[PDB]
Design a protein around this ligand. Structure first.
Ligand code: ANP
Ligand code: MG
Length: 349
């Protein structure tokens, strides 16, 4: 029999055994396991995306991007399992290195030292520099998508929302709405919902940094439209300069309609925090996408000066172009392309 975990079958045997629940999502489960061939612990991410076109499109991106990345702060695909024939393929199992925990879990039991906070943030942006260098948006950075080891090694995971945006095309109007986990959404996801850029990742990192500072989501929006309130609750009302830059009239007017809100100094929310950390937190959580700090300048910031070394922060040698964005296709065609992507992992080939 294939091992079961909480009544979800995990058809990965006989190579991978002793499964333990580690996490789940809308359309998949993750287990700790033992690689009987390499005599190592692993993590296996069961993905069951074939019923919907969105899940298929995201699954194909997550595999294609992760397969072409190699970076110390980005989880690798060791192995992919699926059925030997497409009709029989109903799930896809993505075997990765087992990390010990994630930031979400770590933050429930630990107040992190300034040194840890600093070093984790350093690693997040080291990764994010590779990701952005490659013309990828991650689009779901949050504590639970950051893995950790007792050595304090960090890895970005869950490229389930990630995507290529070739900088040689204007993606305004073509990007998916409603991306990221709600508390980590940049304001322009709400106001320029198809017109955002990779700066939405730098916003997510601000929220993660805040969360590392206070063990608490800074912007805990109770629902989609409450999220924009919690943001302005701290940042104050946008400047007149910041409103004019919102091209969407519908969204500009809604903001103009809202009551005036005052800025909460970072000092007041993080009274025991490093001032340098609050400075970077300020540049990462800037309302204007265009004035918000970029990944390179973030690393260069004084807070991360013990770790910054552009000689030891790799970038992608072949950044991804429009060709890797041709996924606006029926679920049956995307399943075929997922079959083709995962074939190099099969007895055969
Ligand atoms: N390689 C790994 N090592 C250790 N834990 C892992 C690993 N991969 C995933 N996890 C854990 O599994 C959880 C869910 O995995 P993830 O890849 O984020 O799933 P998801 O199905 O996309 N869910 P969601 O982030 O809500 O979209 C993570 O938040 C971690 O707690
Ligand atoms: Mg996901």
């Amino acid at each position: 029999g294939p091992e079961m975990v909480r009544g979800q079958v995990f058809d990965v045997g006989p190579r991978y055994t002793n499964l333990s629940y580690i996490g789940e999502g809308a359309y998949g489960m993750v287990c700790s396991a033992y690689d009987n061939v390499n005599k190592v612990r692993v993590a296996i991410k069961k993905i069951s995306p074939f019923e919907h076109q969105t899940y298929c499109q995201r699954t194909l991106r997550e595999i294609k991007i992760l397969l072409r990345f190699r970076h110390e702060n980005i989880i690798g695909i060791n192995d992919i399992i699926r059925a030997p024939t497409i009709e029989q393929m109903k799930d896809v199992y993505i075997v990765q290195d087992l990390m010990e925990t994630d930031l979400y879990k770590l933050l429930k039991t630990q107040h992190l030292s300034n040194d840890h906070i600093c070093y984790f943030l350093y690693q997040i942006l080291r990764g994010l520099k590779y990701i952005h260098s490659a013309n990828v948006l991650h689009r779901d950075l949050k504590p639970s998508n950051l893995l950790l080891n007792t050595t304090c090694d960090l890895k970005i995971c869950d490229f389930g929302l990630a995507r290529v945006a070739d900088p040689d095309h204007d993606h305004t109007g073509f990007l998916t709405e409603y991306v990221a986990t709600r508390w980590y959404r940049a304001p322009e996801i709400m106001l320029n919902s198809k017109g955002y850029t990779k700066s939405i990742d730098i916003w997510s990192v601000g929220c993660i940094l805040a969360e590392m500072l206070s063990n608490r989501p800074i912007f805990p929006g109770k629902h989609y439209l409450d999220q924009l309130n919690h943001i302005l609750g701290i940042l104050g009302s946008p400047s007149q300069e910041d409103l004019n830059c919102i091209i969407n009239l519908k969204a500009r007017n809604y903001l103009l309609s809202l009551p005036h809100k005052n800025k909460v100094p970072w000092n007041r929310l993080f009274p025991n925090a490093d001032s340098k950390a609050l400075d970077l937190l300020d540049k990462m959580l800037t309302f204007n996408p265009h004035k918000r700090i970029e990944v390179e300048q973030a690393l260069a910031h004084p807070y991360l000066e013990q770790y910054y070394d552009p000689s030891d922060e790799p970038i992608a040698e072949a950044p991804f172009k429009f060709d890797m964005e041709l996924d606006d296709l029926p679920k049956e065609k995307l399943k075929e392309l997922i079959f083709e992507e995962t074939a190099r992992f099969q007895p055969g080939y």
